[PDB]
Structure 1
Amino acid sequence: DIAGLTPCSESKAYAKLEKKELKTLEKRLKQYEADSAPAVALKATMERTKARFANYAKAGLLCGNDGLPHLIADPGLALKYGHAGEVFIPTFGFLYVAGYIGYVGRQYLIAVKGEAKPTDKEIIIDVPLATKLAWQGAGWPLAAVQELQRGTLLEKEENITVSP
Protein backbone atom coordinates (compact mmCIF):
# COMPACT_ATOMS: atom_id res chain seq x y z
CA ASP A 1 0.00 0.00 0.00
CA ILE A 2 2.04 2.91 -1.34
CA ALA A 3 -0.04 4.65 -4.02
CA GLY A 4 -3.52 3.21 -3.55
CA LEU A 5 -2.00 -0.25 -3.95
CA THR A 6 -1.82 -3.45 -1.89
CA PRO A 7 0.61 -6.36 -1.50
CA CYS A 8 -0.04 -9.14 -3.99
CA SER A 9 0.22 -11.60 -1.11
CA GLU A 10 -2.68 -9.64 0.41
CA SER A 11 -4.92 -8.82 -2.55
CA LYS A 12 -7.58 -11.23 -3.73
CA ALA A 13 -7.97 -10.44 -7.43
CA TYR A 14 -4.36 -11.58 -7.74
CA ALA A 15 -5.24 -14.91 -6.14
CA LYS A 16 -8.43 -14.97 -8.20
CA LEU A 17 -6.40 -14.62 -11.40
CA GLU A 18 -3.96 -17.31 -10.26
CA LYS A 19 -6.93 -19.61 -9.78
CA LYS A 20 -8.19 -18.43 -13.16
CA GLU A 21 -5.03 -19.54 -14.95
CA LEU A 22 -4.72 -22.87 -13.12
CA LYS A 23 -8.34 -23.55 -14.03
CA THR A 24 -7.51 -23.03 -17.72
CA LEU A 25 -4.47 -25.28 -17.51
CA GLU A 26 -6.34 -28.09 -15.75
CA LYS A 27 -9.30 -28.10 -18.15
CA ARG A 28 -6.63 -28.30 -20.84
CA LEU A 29 -4.89 -31.06 -18.86
CA LYS A 30 -8.02 -33.26 -18.76
CA GLN A 31 -7.70 -34.39 -22.39
CA TYR A 32 -4.60 -36.52 -21.82
CA GLU A 33 -3.42 -39.62 -20.00
CA ALA A 34 -1.52 -39.09 -16.76
CA ASP A 35 1.60 -40.69 -18.27
CA SER A 36 1.48 -38.76 -21.55
CA ALA A 37 4.05 -36.08 -22.32
CA PRO A 38 1.30 -33.62 -23.44
CA ALA A 39 0.17 -33.94 -19.80
CA VAL A 40 3.69 -34.03 -18.34
CA ALA A 41 4.29 -30.74 -20.14
CA LEU A 42 1.15 -29.10 -18.76
CA LYS A 43 1.83 -30.16 -15.18
CA ALA A 44 5.33 -28.75 -15.60
CA THR A 45 3.70 -25.56 -16.87
CA MET A 46 1.63 -25.40 -13.68
CA GLU A 47 4.62 -25.87 -11.40
CA ARG A 48 6.35 -23.07 -13.26
CA THR A 49 3.12 -21.10 -12.92
CA LYS A 50 2.38 -21.73 -9.24
CA ALA A 51 5.99 -21.02 -8.27
CA ARG A 52 5.76 -17.78 -10.25
CA PHE A 53 2.83 -16.56 -8.16
CA ALA A 54 4.61 -17.75 -5.02
CA ASN A 55 7.74 -15.82 -5.98
CA TYR A 56 5.92 -12.61 -6.83
CA ALA A 57 4.17 -12.62 -3.46
CA LYS A 58 7.50 -13.52 -1.84
CA ALA A 59 9.17 -10.38 -3.17
CA GLY A 60 6.29 -8.23 -1.95
CA LEU A 61 5.14 -6.98 -5.34
CA LEU A 62 2.31 -4.47 -5.27
CA CYS A 63 -1.07 -5.33 -6.74
CA GLY A 64 -3.89 -2.92 -7.34
CA ASN A 65 -7.44 -2.86 -8.60
CA ASP A 66 -6.68 -5.49 -11.25
CA GLY A 67 -4.53 -7.86 -9.19
CA LEU A 68 -1.34 -7.46 -11.22
CA PRO A 69 2.20 -6.72 -10.01
CA HIS A 70 2.67 -2.94 -10.19
CA LEU A 71 6.16 -1.45 -10.19
CA ILE A 72 7.38 1.60 -8.29
CA ALA A 73 10.08 3.44 -10.25
CA ASP A 74 11.06 6.02 -7.68
CA PRO A 75 13.96 5.83 -5.23
CA GLY A 76 12.81 7.06 -1.87
CA LEU A 77 9.56 5.19 -2.30
CA ALA A 78 11.32 1.97 -3.29
CA LEU A 79 14.28 2.36 -0.94
CA LYS A 80 11.96 3.30 1.92
CA TYR A 81 9.35 0.57 1.42
CA GLY A 82 11.67 -2.21 0.26
CA HIS A 83 11.19 -2.25 -3.50
CA ALA A 84 14.56 -1.40 -5.00
CA GLY A 85 14.61 -4.73 -6.84
CA GLU A 86 11.70 -3.68 -9.06
CA VAL A 87 13.40 -0.76 -10.83
CA PHE A 88 16.21 0.70 -8.70
CA ILE A 89 18.39 -2.41 -8.73
CA PRO A 90 18.00 -3.17 -12.50
CA THR A 91 18.47 0.51 -13.34
CA PHE A 92 22.12 0.01 -12.35
CA GLY A 93 22.30 -3.63 -13.35
CA PHE A 94 21.42 -2.38 -16.81
CA LEU A 95 23.64 0.71 -16.86
CA TYR A 96 26.63 -1.43 -15.96
CA VAL A 97 26.08 -3.62 -19.04
CA ALA A 98 25.00 -0.69 -21.24
CA GLY A 99 28.07 1.45 -20.76
CA TYR A 100 30.11 -1.74 -20.86
CA ILE A 101 29.04 -2.38 -24.46
CA GLY A 102 29.58 1.31 -25.11
CA TYR A 103 33.08 1.32 -23.64
CA VAL A 104 34.22 -1.88 -25.38
CA GLY A 105 32.91 -0.50 -28.66
CA ARG A 106 34.57 2.81 -27.87
CA GLN A 107 37.97 1.29 -27.11
CA TYR A 108 37.78 -0.84 -30.25
CA LEU A 109 37.21 2.24 -32.39
CA ILE A 110 39.84 4.35 -30.64
CA ALA A 111 42.45 1.61 -30.94
CA VAL A 112 41.83 1.06 -34.64
CA LYS A 113 42.27 4.60 -35.96
CA GLY A 114 46.05 4.48 -35.62
CA GLU A 115 46.49 2.02 -38.50
CA ALA A 116 46.90 1.81 -42.26
CA LYS A 117 43.21 1.73 -43.24
CA PRO A 118 40.82 1.46 -40.28
CA THR A 119 37.74 0.87 -42.44
CA ASP A 120 38.97 -2.64 -43.23
CA LYS A 121 39.03 -3.55 -39.55
CA GLU A 122 35.41 -2.59 -39.10
CA ILE A 123 34.46 -5.29 -41.59
CA ILE A 124 37.06 -7.77 -40.41
CA ILE A 125 36.89 -7.46 -36.64
CA ASP A 126 40.28 -8.10 -35.09
CA VAL A 127 39.07 -10.90 -32.83
CA PRO A 128 42.30 -11.18 -30.75
CA LEU A 129 42.05 -7.42 -30.25
CA ALA A 130 38.30 -7.17 -29.76
CA THR A 131 38.07 -9.95 -27.19
CA LYS A 132 41.06 -8.45 -25.39
CA LEU A 133 39.20 -5.18 -24.99
CA ALA A 134 36.05 -7.15 -24.14
CA TRP A 135 37.52 -8.85 -21.06
CA GLN A 136 39.54 -5.91 -19.79
CA GLY A 137 36.65 -3.45 -20.05
CA ALA A 138 35.01 -4.96 -16.96
CA GLY A 139 36.01 -2.01 -14.81
CA TRP A 140 34.77 0.54 -17.30
CA PRO A 141 33.24 3.05 -14.79
CA LEU A 142 36.56 2.97 -12.97
CA ALA A 143 38.29 3.79 -16.26
CA ALA A 144 35.75 6.26 -17.66
CA VAL A 145 35.65 8.63 -14.68
CA GLN A 146 39.44 8.78 -14.78
CA GLU A 147 39.18 9.64 -18.46
CA LEU A 148 36.38 12.06 -17.54
CA GLN A 149 38.74 14.02 -15.28
CA ARG A 150 41.43 14.61 -17.91
CA GLY A 151 39.64 16.08 -20.89
CA THR A 152 40.49 13.14 -23.15
CA LEU A 153 36.91 11.83 -23.19
CA LEU A 154 35.51 14.96 -24.83
CA GLU A 155 37.13 15.96 -28.09
CA LYS A 156 37.35 19.75 -28.37
CA GLU A 157 36.08 22.04 -31.13
CA GLU A 158 37.97 20.13 -33.77
CA ASN A 159 34.49 18.74 -34.42
CA ILE A 160 32.81 19.47 -37.71
CA THR A 161 30.27 22.29 -38.11
CA VAL A 162 28.30 23.99 -40.87
CA SER A 163 27.81 27.71 -40.25
CA PRO A 164 28.02 28.85 -36.60
Structure 2
Amino acid sequence: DIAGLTPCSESKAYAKLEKKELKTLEKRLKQYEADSAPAVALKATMERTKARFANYAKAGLLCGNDGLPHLIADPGLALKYGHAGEVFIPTFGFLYVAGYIGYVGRQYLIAVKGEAKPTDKEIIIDVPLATKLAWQGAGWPLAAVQELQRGTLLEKEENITVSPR
Protein backbone atom coordinates (compact mmCIF):
# COMPACT_ATOMS: atom_id res chain seq x y z
CA ASP A 1 0.00 0.00 0.00
CA ILE A 2 1.60 3.28 1.12
CA ALA A 3 5.43 3.10 1.15
CA GLY A 4 5.40 -0.64 0.49
CA LEU A 5 3.56 -1.37 3.75
CA THR A 6 1.19 -4.32 3.84
CA PRO A 7 -2.10 -4.08 5.76
CA CYS A 8 -2.00 -5.62 9.22
CA SER A 9 -4.88 -7.98 8.44
CA GLU A 10 -2.74 -9.33 5.58
CA SER A 11 0.63 -9.24 7.38
CA LYS A 12 2.08 -12.53 8.60
CA ALA A 13 4.46 -11.17 11.25
CA TYR A 14 1.41 -9.49 12.82
CA ALA A 15 -0.25 -12.90 13.28
CA LYS A 16 3.10 -14.31 14.45
CA LEU A 17 3.39 -11.61 17.13
CA GLU A 18 -0.23 -12.22 18.18
CA LYS A 19 0.46 -15.96 18.50
CA LYS A 20 3.72 -15.30 20.38
CA GLU A 21 2.01 -13.08 22.95
CA LEU A 22 -0.78 -15.63 23.42
CA LYS A 23 1.90 -18.31 23.85
CA THR A 24 3.70 -16.31 26.56
CA LEU A 25 0.40 -15.68 28.36
CA GLU A 26 -0.64 -19.34 28.24
CA LYS A 27 2.81 -20.46 29.43
CA ARG A 28 2.25 -18.17 32.40
CA LEU A 29 -1.34 -19.48 32.69
CA LYS A 30 -0.62 -23.22 32.78
CA GLN A 31 0.93 -23.16 36.30
CA TYR A 32 -2.25 -22.28 38.22
CA GLU A 33 -5.64 -23.78 39.07
CA ALA A 34 -8.69 -23.53 36.78
CA ASP A 35 -11.03 -21.16 38.64
CA SER A 36 -8.43 -19.21 40.65
CA ALA A 37 -7.87 -15.46 40.63
CA PRO A 38 -4.50 -15.51 38.75
CA ALA A 39 -6.17 -17.72 36.14
CA VAL A 40 -9.08 -15.28 35.79
CA ALA A 41 -6.64 -12.35 35.54
CA LEU A 42 -4.56 -14.04 32.84
CA LYS A 43 -7.67 -15.06 30.89
CA ALA A 44 -8.87 -11.44 30.98
CA THR A 45 -5.39 -10.45 29.76
CA MET A 46 -5.65 -12.92 26.85
CA GLU A 47 -9.17 -11.66 26.06
CA ARG A 48 -7.94 -8.05 25.91
CA THR A 49 -4.98 -9.13 23.76
CA LYS A 50 -7.20 -10.89 21.21
CA ALA A 51 -9.64 -7.95 21.23
CA ARG A 52 -6.80 -5.45 20.71
CA PHE A 53 -5.33 -7.35 17.76
CA ALA A 54 -8.80 -7.73 16.23
CA ASN A 55 -9.43 -3.99 16.67
CA TYR A 56 -6.10 -3.04 15.11
CA ALA A 57 -6.66 -5.36 12.14
CA LYS A 58 -10.23 -4.02 11.87
CA ALA A 59 -9.23 -0.34 11.63
CA GLY A 60 -7.12 -0.86 8.50
CA LEU A 61 -3.71 -0.14 10.01
CA LEU A 62 -0.58 -0.64 7.91
CA CYS A 63 2.08 -3.03 9.20
CA GLY A 64 5.72 -3.20 8.16
CA ASN A 65 8.19 -6.03 7.73
CA ASP A 66 8.07 -6.64 11.50
CA GLY A 67 4.30 -6.69 12.01
CA LEU A 68 3.79 -3.41 13.85
CA PRO A 69 1.21 -0.70 13.03
CA HIS A 70 2.60 2.30 11.16
CA LEU A 71 0.97 5.73 11.10
CA ILE A 72 0.62 8.06 8.11
CA ALA A 73 1.17 11.80 8.65
CA ASP A 74 0.21 13.63 5.43
CA PRO A 75 -3.35 15.03 5.18
CA GLY A 76 -4.00 14.18 1.54
CA LEU A 77 -2.41 10.73 1.48
CA ALA A 78 -4.27 9.64 4.62
CA LEU A 79 -7.57 11.14 3.46
CA LYS A 80 -7.09 9.37 0.11
CA TYR A 81 -6.19 5.92 1.46
CA GLY A 82 -8.46 5.99 4.51
CA HIS A 83 -5.96 6.65 7.30
CA ALA A 84 -7.40 9.91 8.62
CA GLY A 85 -8.19 8.58 12.09
CA GLU A 86 -4.61 8.21 13.27
CA VAL A 87 -2.95 11.64 12.88
CA PHE A 88 -5.42 14.08 11.26
CA ILE A 89 -8.49 13.62 13.48
CA PRO A 90 -6.14 13.32 16.52
CA THR A 91 -4.31 16.55 15.60
CA PHE A 92 -7.52 18.54 15.33
CA GLY A 93 -8.79 16.96 18.55
CA PHE A 94 -5.59 18.02 20.28
CA LEU A 95 -5.76 21.54 18.87
CA TYR A 96 -9.33 21.84 20.18
CA VAL A 97 -8.44 20.80 23.73
CA ALA A 98 -5.09 22.68 23.83
CA GLY A 99 -6.64 25.92 22.62
CA TYR A 100 -9.45 25.32 25.13
CA ILE A 101 -6.93 25.25 28.00
CA GLY A 102 -5.01 28.25 26.66
CA TYR A 103 -8.12 30.36 26.09
CA VAL A 104 -9.52 29.61 29.56
CA GLY A 105 -6.17 30.58 31.12
CA ARG A 106 -6.01 33.79 29.08
CA GLN A 107 -9.55 34.77 30.05
CA TYR A 108 -8.75 34.08 33.71
CA LEU A 109 -5.67 36.33 33.50
CA ILE A 110 -7.57 39.19 31.85
CA ALA A 111 -10.40 38.73 34.36
CA VAL A 112 -8.07 38.97 37.38
CA LYS A 113 -5.86 41.82 36.11
CA GLY A 114 -8.73 44.29 36.57
CA GLU A 115 -8.73 44.11 40.36
CA ALA A 116 -6.82 45.51 43.35
CA LYS A 117 -5.03 42.17 43.92
CA PRO A 118 -4.18 40.34 40.67
CA THR A 119 -1.33 38.38 42.23
CA ASP A 120 -3.56 37.42 45.17
CA LYS A 121 -6.03 35.94 42.71
CA GLU A 122 -3.13 34.20 40.97
CA ILE A 123 -2.05 32.46 44.20
CA ILE A 124 -5.56 31.76 45.56
CA ILE A 125 -7.89 30.77 42.76
CA ASP A 126 -11.29 32.39 42.33
CA VAL A 127 -13.12 29.07 41.89
CA PRO A 128 -16.56 30.40 40.71
CA LEU A 129 -14.93 32.68 38.12
CA ALA A 130 -12.64 29.82 37.04
CA THR A 131 -15.60 27.46 36.60
CA LYS A 132 -17.57 30.14 34.73
CA LEU A 133 -14.70 30.66 32.29
CA ALA A 134 -14.17 26.88 32.07
CA TRP A 135 -17.77 26.36 30.95
CA GLN A 136 -17.75 29.40 28.64
CA GLY A 137 -14.56 28.31 26.90
CA ALA A 138 -16.26 25.81 24.57
CA GLY A 139 -16.63 28.43 21.86
CA TRP A 140 -12.94 29.33 22.04
CA PRO A 141 -12.11 29.08 18.26
CA LEU A 142 -14.95 31.43 17.32
CA ALA A 143 -14.01 33.87 20.09
CA ALA A 144 -10.33 33.50 19.15
CA VAL A 145 -10.87 34.42 15.50
CA GLN A 146 -13.18 37.26 16.56
CA GLU A 147 -10.51 38.67 18.89
CA LEU A 148 -8.04 38.21 16.03
CA GLN A 149 -10.19 40.17 13.58
CA ARG A 150 -10.80 43.10 15.97
CA GLY A 151 -7.16 43.67 16.89
CA THR A 152 -7.80 42.96 20.57
CA LEU A 153 -5.94 39.63 20.49
CA LEU A 154 -2.60 41.46 20.41
CA GLU A 155 -0.93 43.99 22.63
CA LYS A 156 0.60 46.90 20.71
CA GLU A 157 4.22 48.06 21.09
CA GLU A 158 3.68 49.01 24.71
CA ASN A 159 5.62 45.84 25.54
CA ILE A 160 8.83 45.59 27.53
CA THR A 161 12.01 45.58 25.42
CA VAL A 162 15.75 46.12 25.81
CA SER A 163 17.53 49.38 24.88
CA PRO A 164 18.49 48.09 21.35
CA ARG A 165 14.81 47.00 21.03
**Smaller-chain TM-score range?**
over 0.9
Cα distance in 1 between the residues matched to 2:163 and 2:43: 68
User: Separation in 2 of the partners of 1:6 and 1:49?
Assistant: 21
Gaps of 5+ in 1: none
Structure 1: how far apart are the matches of 2:60 and 2:159? 51
CA displacement 1:4-38 (0-9 Å, x = unmatched): 10100000000100001000000000011110010
Alpha-carbon offset, residue 163 of structure 1: 2.2
User: Percent sequence identity over matched residues?
Assistant: 100
Give the total of aligned pairs.
164
Distance in 1, matches of 2:139 and 2:46, equals 42
- Give structure 2 stretches of 5+ with no counterpart: none
CA–CA separation in structure 1 for the residues paired with 2:137 and 2:17: 45
The Cα shift of 1:134 comes to 0.1
CA distance in 2, matches of 1:2, 1:162: 51
Q: Secondary structure at the match of 2:3?
A: coil
1:101 is displaced (CA, Å) by: 0.2
d(CA) in 2 for partners of 1:48, 1:73: 28
| TM-score normalised according to structure 1 size | 0.99
Q: Alpha-carbon deviation of 1:117?
A: 1.3
CA distance in 1, matches of 2:163, 2:91: 39
Q: SS at 1:139's partner residue?
A: helix
Structure 1 residue 81: deviation in Å? 0.2
Question: Which residue of the partner structure matches residue 43 of structure 2?
Answer: 43
